[PDB]
């Protein structure tokens, strides 16, 4: 029983903390504000059964924003290949990746 008293009486008891894309103090965005807004605007109103299979792309982009698993996997692969080539001596890092370049601004 989801007695939806909040929609019935028009009050807002807990909808404000529900999502990251809601009205925040000082308009502070979440790091995955855009992905969550796109997933919610995709999956709105069509129901959960259609929302699982029709909004899979926005939800996968939003989950990969939240936990950054593919990104950290890619950084693992690049750093591991770099360390292997440093061990083989077939690669040298540039001066701007060794700290000898007098940073931009």
């Amino acid at each position: 029983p989801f007695f939806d008293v909040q929609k019935k009486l028009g009050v807002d008891l807990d909808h404000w903390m529900t999502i990251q894309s809601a009205e925040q103090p000082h308009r502070i965005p979440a790091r995955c504000h855009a992905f969550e807004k796109e997933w919610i605007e995709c999956a709105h109103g069509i129901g959960s059964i259609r929302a699982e299979k029709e909004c899979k792309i926005e939800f996968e982009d939003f989950r990969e924003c939240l936990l950054r698993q593919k990104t950290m996997k890619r950084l693992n692969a690049i750093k591991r290949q770099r360390d292997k080539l440093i061990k083989e001596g077939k690669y040298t890092p540039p001066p701007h990746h060794s700290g000898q370049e007098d940073l931009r601004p």
Binding site: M17, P25, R31, K73
Partner: protein
């Protein structure tokens, strides 16, 4: 090594739990939970949770574990193998976790975990002239009206409940 520092604290955090979960005595277990609270506070502080870490000190440690140690010192009158075996079991399982996720930069106990230092997941911007966490806690009085009502009511009722059940009449 210093890029892994929060991870290092978390290891000590897990070690601290194998301190009191093995349950040597409730007073040494209280001490282990105090040390665990301090290092978990350090974990919180190193992401930018200054106010939440000082809540771990002031309210969890200085507020609640004081009452745990206080109540415990009024029992268990002052003066094991299962504790020592449980402690070395938990420590060896934790160091096998450390060894696997450092040799592979990836592990999967229940979820997949990266083995890089946890600095990689941060944001590269500024929050201006405010802590975002401070303003989100300040929003408890502006946006959190129902949350304030139910929490303060539960605390008042908790006062009433403790006075009813500790009376025996």
């Amino acid at each position: 090594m210093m890029t892994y520092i929060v991870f290092i604290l978390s290891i000590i955090f897990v070690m601290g739990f194998v301190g009191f979960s093995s349950k040597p005595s409730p007073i040494y277990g209280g001490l282990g939970l105090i040390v665990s609270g301090g290092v978990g506070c350090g974990i919180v502080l190193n992401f930018g949770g200054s106010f939440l870490g000082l809540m771990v000190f002031l309210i969890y440690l200085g507020g609640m574990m004081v009452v745990f140690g206080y109540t415990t010192a009024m029992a268990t009158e002052q003066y094991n193998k299962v504790v020592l075996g449980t402690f070395i079991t938990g420590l060896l399982m934790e160091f096998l976790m450390v060894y696997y996720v450092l040799k592979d930069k990836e592990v999967e106990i229940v979820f997949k975990f990266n083995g890089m230092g946890d600095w990689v997941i941060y944001d590269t911007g500024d929050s201006g002239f405010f802590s975002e966490e401070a303003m989100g806690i300040a929003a408890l009085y502006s946006y959190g009206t129902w949350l304030v009502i139910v929490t303060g009511w539960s605390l008042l009722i908790g006062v009433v409940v403790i006075m009813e059940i500790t009376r025996g009449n």
